[PDB]
Amino acid sequence: HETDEEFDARWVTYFNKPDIDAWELRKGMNTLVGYDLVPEPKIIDAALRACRRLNDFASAVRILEVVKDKAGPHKEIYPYVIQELRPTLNELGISTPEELGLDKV
Amino acid sequence: FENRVAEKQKLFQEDNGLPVHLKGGATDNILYRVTMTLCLGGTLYSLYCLGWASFPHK
Amino acid sequence: APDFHDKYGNAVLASGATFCVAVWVYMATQIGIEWNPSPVGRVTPKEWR
Amino acid sequence: MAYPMQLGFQDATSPIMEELLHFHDHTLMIVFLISSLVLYIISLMLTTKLTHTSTMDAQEVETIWTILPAIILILIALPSLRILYMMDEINNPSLTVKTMGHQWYWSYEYTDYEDLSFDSYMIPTSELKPGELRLLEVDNRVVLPMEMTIRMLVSSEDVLHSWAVPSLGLKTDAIPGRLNQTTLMSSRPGLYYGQCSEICGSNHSFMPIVLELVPLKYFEKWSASML
Amino acid sequence: MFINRWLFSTNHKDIGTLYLLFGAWAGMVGTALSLLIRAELGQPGTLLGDDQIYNVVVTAHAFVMIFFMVMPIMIGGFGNWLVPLMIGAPDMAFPRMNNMSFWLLPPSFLLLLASSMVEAGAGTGWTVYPPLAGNLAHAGASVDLTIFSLHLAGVSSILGAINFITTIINMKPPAMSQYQTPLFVWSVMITAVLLLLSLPVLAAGITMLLTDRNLNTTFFDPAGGGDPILYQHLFWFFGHPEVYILILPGFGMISHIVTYYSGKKEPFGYMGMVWAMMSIGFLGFIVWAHHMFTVGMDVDTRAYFTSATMIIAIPTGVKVFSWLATLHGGNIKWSPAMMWALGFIFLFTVGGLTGIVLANSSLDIVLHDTYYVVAHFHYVLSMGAVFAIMGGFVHWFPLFSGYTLNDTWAKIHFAIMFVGVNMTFFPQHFLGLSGMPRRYSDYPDAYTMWNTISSMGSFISLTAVMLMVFIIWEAFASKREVLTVDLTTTNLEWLNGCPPPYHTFEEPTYVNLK
Amino acid sequence: ITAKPAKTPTSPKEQAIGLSVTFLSFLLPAGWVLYHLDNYKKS
Amino acid sequence: KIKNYQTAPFDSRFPNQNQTRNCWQNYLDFHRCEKAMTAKGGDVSVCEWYRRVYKSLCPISWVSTWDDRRAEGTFPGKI
Amino acid sequence: ASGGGVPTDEEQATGLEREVMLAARKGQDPYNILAPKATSGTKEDPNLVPSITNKRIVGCICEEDNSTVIWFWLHKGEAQRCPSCGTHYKLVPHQLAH
Amino acid sequence: HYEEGPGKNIPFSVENKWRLLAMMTLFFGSGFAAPFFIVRHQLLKK
Amino acid sequence: HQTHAYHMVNPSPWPLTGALSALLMTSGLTMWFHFNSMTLLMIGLTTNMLTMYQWWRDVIRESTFQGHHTPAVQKGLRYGMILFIISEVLFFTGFFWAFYHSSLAPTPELGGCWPPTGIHPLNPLEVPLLNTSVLLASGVSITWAHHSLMEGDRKHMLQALFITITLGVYFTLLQASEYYEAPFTISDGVYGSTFFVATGFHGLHVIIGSTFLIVCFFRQLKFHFTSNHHFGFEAAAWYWHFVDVVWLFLYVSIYWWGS
Amino acid sequence: ASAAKGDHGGTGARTWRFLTFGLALPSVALCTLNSWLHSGHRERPAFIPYHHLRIRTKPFSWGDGNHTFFHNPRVNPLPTGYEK
Amino acid sequence: SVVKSEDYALPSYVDRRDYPLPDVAHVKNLSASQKALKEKEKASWSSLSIDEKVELYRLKFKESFAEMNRSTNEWKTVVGAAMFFIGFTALLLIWEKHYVYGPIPHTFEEEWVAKQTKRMLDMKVAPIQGFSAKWDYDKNEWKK
Amino acid sequence: STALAKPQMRGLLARRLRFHIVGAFMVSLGFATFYKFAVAEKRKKAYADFYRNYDSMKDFEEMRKAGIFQSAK
Ligand code: HEA
Ligand SMILES: CCCCCC/C=C\CCCCCCCCCC(=O)O[C@H](COC(=O)CCCCCCCCCCCCCCC)COP(=O)(O)OC[C@@H](O)CO
Ligand SMILES: CCCCCCCCCCO[C@@H]1O[C@H](CO)[C@@H](O[C@H]2O[C@H](CO)[C@@H](O)[C@H](O)[C@H]2O)[C@H](O)[C@H]1O
Ligand SMILES: CCCCCCCCCCO[C@@H]1O[C@H](CO)[C@@H](O[C@H]2O[C@H](CO)[C@@H](O)[C@H](O)[C@H]2O)[C@H](O)[C@H]1O
């Protein structure tokens, strides 16, 4: 169908809609995690900033958890994504699940 | 004959709580009792006949 | 809070396995079941006629 | 006959039964491969935390899993049907023998020349001679010439039975009113055993078949002595 | 009120519950008969008596398991509970006739018990072939009682088929086409078409047997120009469709279970699944004489029946691979129902493959009327139809009852049964290849090791059946009420809660056409 | 699925009673018949 | 004349597993021939091929029953 | 010789049959015999779902020829969206018979 | 109307788990026992 | 209150009395065949008739008198009747298969011929041809009755339906006389077996179909049918055409080709 | 085929009554004539106790067990021949 | 918090790794301090404490991914109990052998089997592969 | 410290599937080769070797001398 970059750009556009509502935030994340991919940092960045516009800190943490979950046994993917998102995490004051202790079973 | 279906419609739509098989009146109950008595009595008799037929008779 | 499996799982696994092996070995060897294995390498043929 | 702990077919006594052995090896390889592949793919589908739950297009893969099974079926059917038509080929027998099933024994008629017939009953367990086989020996064996094409004709004088000798690859139903034909050819002398193969009442388990294959000259003297 | 509700029902859920209870009781009868078979065979010699008592037990075992356990549970039980809910219908089309399909089954079962109590029983095989089943070799009432038992079970199922086909064609939401109905509903529709067409031919054949036995007809008697083999054609024209009737609702339940516990909204390849069930239903009417390869048919007929039978592997393979593709990528929930469905995919595949071996008429000469056939059909029945029944029972018990099972106990139950059925039936392949016949109360000594193991497996399966009764007791004893069920957006039967109210869909669903 | 805690919890002792009664319901009548087979067969 | 008979040969009229009609036809042929020969004054020796074939193929009880029914006047085939 | 004497449905139909007949004459479908035609399904133009109570089950065939139907309860109040395609639905409760 | 809800949509009571155990014992145990008693019956004839 | 068009049926005893009637008829036939007694069979036949009467009575109450047969319910009953007829076609197919099996390969016991030695078939050009003209004529008169009903013509519906029933009765009386006059019997080997079981089940269906037509006649006398709503008449007419077509196959196969 | 008739325009009650009285009932009357013309007993053939006829494997459950249900003494012999 | 039977047709909460953002919050009713926390969440999240951030997470969600995905010791109970019940089965088989089965036939006696084995070798049972093929007729012993 | 490289993030399930379906195919071919050598050809060679110099009269004479026959002493 479409290139990787075209797919990524549609998803960035989706989450960047300024007046995205809570339902659309959830619909987007719950649809995105059905695909055979871990979303690119630029997609996650847009989704986290949507959480910020929706005043929803908890869903921002949950989205970081679902990035780690989608990587499965590929343990190198989540730390990479967190690395790429650190400027956004610092800017928005988003703590990672690990910083909150929410990676403990 | 005259068309008396409207009379039967009134009878069978009367708001009396009766199920359809009893809604014609007292004759329905009698015929039900006859049917159910013959069925249940006949079924007991069939079980007696099985008891009889399950053993040899010399 | 530990659940039933945390508390008793090790004991159920060890006891069930030990019991199962013991009682099937006893059944298979001690009560006179005739398994009729192959005579090959086991039976010394004997004159019959 | 079968031997203890046996896993597969009795060794072949006839060329058609050898053909069936090789055909079964071919088909069992396929059965093992497909069963193992399904078990393996189950294990593969069940052993990853990776997910993909959106709609999956089916059209492409359904070509694979209709075409490959169709090819496999053809690779089974081709040797299967070759053997089927071999078994049916014209062969010109030297001898015709009839067997009639009864409750619960077999009778045999050899009426090409003389009026020869007899009954064949299981040896009771209490009367077995030392080394004889429980439920398989008979009083009067079906003596036949080895290395010769024999027409067997099978029928019944009461209920259904079925006349079977596994090591020759034979099983022909015994149907009253019907005369079913099969061909028998042993490559070897010896004693070849079978058992009634259609439920026929109280002693279905207890009406076996024992063929005794010997050289023609011994068969001819046996036949004459049985008149 | 109790009589009105449970003897005079016109409600699809209560009638479904009646069928599940009847089928569960029949399954205990059928399990007891299977233990008697394996007790007789578990050591060499004679335990109970000669082959007459033994084959009365074998014949009843098959009739009970097929007509009183599998078909009532799958079609009467799961079909009545689930089909109306899955299409948003308020009941079956003929809700009162539906009740008579249920109430014909206790009389049918009574006739079968009676057949075994009078005279010396019907020791015929579940195929009831003459002349053994005729009035000289089976004089007296037993075989006539068996025929009448089959007549009543056949009327029950023909009326039930009429009801299901009518309900599924006529009572969907107006916007829902047949290609928007769930696969279990398709599997029940197809099964009902097979029942409608096949059971009347069985009824004709067994009526001809009844008149040869009692009215001096000679349909099957050569003395009057009849033919025992005609009865075999009429019986097997029904009997091959009958095995697809036994498995197709199971295929439907397996598609739902695998979809659900894979966390998917839909099965892989829906139209291929519909195609494959229809193809299997159609091909299942043109193959019956593979039950007759040793009767003396012409070679070209044997070749046809070999080839037509093998082609059924193609649509069946599409279903197996589609279940594997439904697992693919799933968020797998290792529930007890999923374990039953995964066992089904593998063990049904094994049994189907030994069926393909048997389809080769040349090889079937040596395998027919041996335990290789018994191994084939118990892989597809005890490890196929029964595994789909147990997966569907564990999955939908909370819907029907409103209570949950203990999942750890249900996994223990699956583990015990899995060992037991495989230990019972796998060695029966060796017994068949090495020539052990069917319907024997005793065997030549060489066959002892595998008969001993097979009987030990049957006792393990007994332990699992006893445990299943305790598990159902524990659930009703503890009363853990259901709260939330996931995936209701693609499993409509759960959306009215657990249990659903007596009347559901009094206001129909809204579905538009766009 | 989620569910409420049991309205009438069945303790391990209660489960052992239910399990034992269930098993004995199946095993005692069949065992009685099979134990007495010889008594039946010759009669 | 074409003796050294061993058994009944393959007959293309009856090539399948069910040989009932082979037995029947040869029994009829023998007895039809025999009736023809005895009538016009002739030798049943000319019927011998059919005799040998039906004796090879036919169960003894079938032949016996058919013989009994020909003697009784109840044999349903045409001779 | 065509005579009369056979009642018509207009004359003699009764009960629910008569209710359905009279509603059809008016172009009304209180007993849900026809499939409703979708709107554009936006939030400004939601699909309007009649009900005699305050919730009704919707099935959404999100795209033409989908075999999967998406089922959910629609409640009285603000429009809700199909969880698969997002198309909007709004309950319109009313009085007696649809 | 009729009773609705868990434990009420069945023809047997689950109000007391021990009465239920007895009823389930009798129900499933009678089906399992019947073939053994029919075999006994067939042996005691002849 | 419901807002669909389907019929929720009142709880009914007739499924149970019908099922018990089936137990009594079958155990009754067993008692008659083996224990020289007709008592159970007579009870079963009586309870079966009572069950059928009250069940179908209640269907008339539900539809003519209570209005529950909306078009959706009527469409379901059309499918139900079509599927029932298909099941009956397959029942007869088993008896046609038996007939062609036995007649196409006549065994030595028959003489190796069909008809068997000793069998003297009826002449298909005599009463069997008359029976064929009678059932074909009744298919024409039931079609006249149907169009009369649709056109609102009470008198001619009743006339045509009476003629149809009369012809069904004529067929049944003719067949009963032919049974008595036939020189062969059900015990005359497979010729008698196939002839009397297949024509006998057909005669049973003629009696059933004639009874169904008589029910429709009296319902029509009582004005139950409207010119557009009369599914019980449609079902009886479909069943009657099925009985006619089965007879045409019996006539061509057993009476004509098999003679 | 178009048979040889040819009405239509509208298949209706008047046409089906025309067919009933103009073709169907005349055909029944013709066949009734043809039948009640060839009736009158035809002689019964010699009795021959063929074994594929007069089957008795179980007594019939009525009468003396040896008479068929619609036994006609004139034309139905028993296994031992015609009644007297 | 408390989910009720009569809530069955309402949007519900679920912890599923494939449905990360459920249809409702885990906790819908808020105390005074929880209300003030949701107000503080409208300002910079850098000003929330770790504990405030955990509290916001636990208002929205019940279990974290690590919690909902945890493994358990249930397999030990399942396998162990299954082996117990399979073990119990052998008790049934021991009972059957003791009380139900009589002696087996005399053809399984050692001497009978030795004579029957010689006779099978004398008639060359399965001489190509199955049985007599394993006997060395030249050395009069089983092939090694 | 240094940054982490960008790993593959897309199609991880499909890549796993492809690799193991190929691996299953290679294993299937290996098994078919093994089975042909260990079962099918073994059986062909066992029957061919048995019959290559087989003397049926000698076999008969051994069986006769062992006393197995009814028809031959
Ligand atoms: C649920 C029950 C059930 C089912 C579904 C089946 C399904 C099949 N059966 Fe079976 N069968 C019985 C129950 C069943 N059978 C019973 C009870 C008997 C005995 C009757 C009696 O005598 O009492 C019997 C007997 C029987 C016989 C007669 C043997 C004899 O008596 O000598 C034959 C012969 O062809 C047969 C064949 C098959 C085949 C080919 C299928 C096929 O439908 C199976 C198709 C499935 C697969 C092939 C597996 C999945 C496919 C793939 C993974 C694709 C790739 C595969 C290939 C390329 C091969 N069965
Ligand atoms: C030993 C005994 C053996 C059996 C003997 C049977 C004897 C005779 C039985 C004859 C059958 C009588 C059937 C009477 C049905 C009456 C009810 C009816 O006809 O009901 C109709 C619905 O059809 C419906 O259910 C249709 C429902 C009935 C279909 C029946 C088809 C025949 C089945 C008979 C059994 C066959 C057995 C074959 C055995 C081999 C009512 O709807 P309408 O007509 O539209 O009216 C409404 C209008 O008034 C509104 O304006
Ligand atoms: C309330 C619902 C209905 C309940 C029905 C209960 C019916 C009970 C009546 C049974 O009576 C028996 O009937 C037998 C047969 O029916 C009789 O046997 C007799 O009947 C045969 C039939 O005529 C004779 O030929 C025999 O000589 C003779 O044994 C027998 O004397 C008598 O005890
Ligand atoms: C395939 C289904 C069955 C599988 C295996 C069944 C396992 C049997 C469980 C026990 O059954 C009991 O066994 C006792 C023996 O242990 C029997 O008592 C019998 O033997 C006792 C000891 O000799 C006497 O005291 C009693 O009076 C006498 O009834 C008793 O009747 C029977 O209920």
Ligand code: CUA
């Ligand atoms: Cu003879 Cu089985």
Ligand SMILES: [Cu+2]
């Ligand atoms: Cu089949």
Ligand SMILES: [Mg+2]
């Ligand atoms: Mg067979």
Ligand code: NA
């Ligand atoms: Na035994």
Ligand SMILES: [Zn+2]
């Ligand atoms: Zn949608």
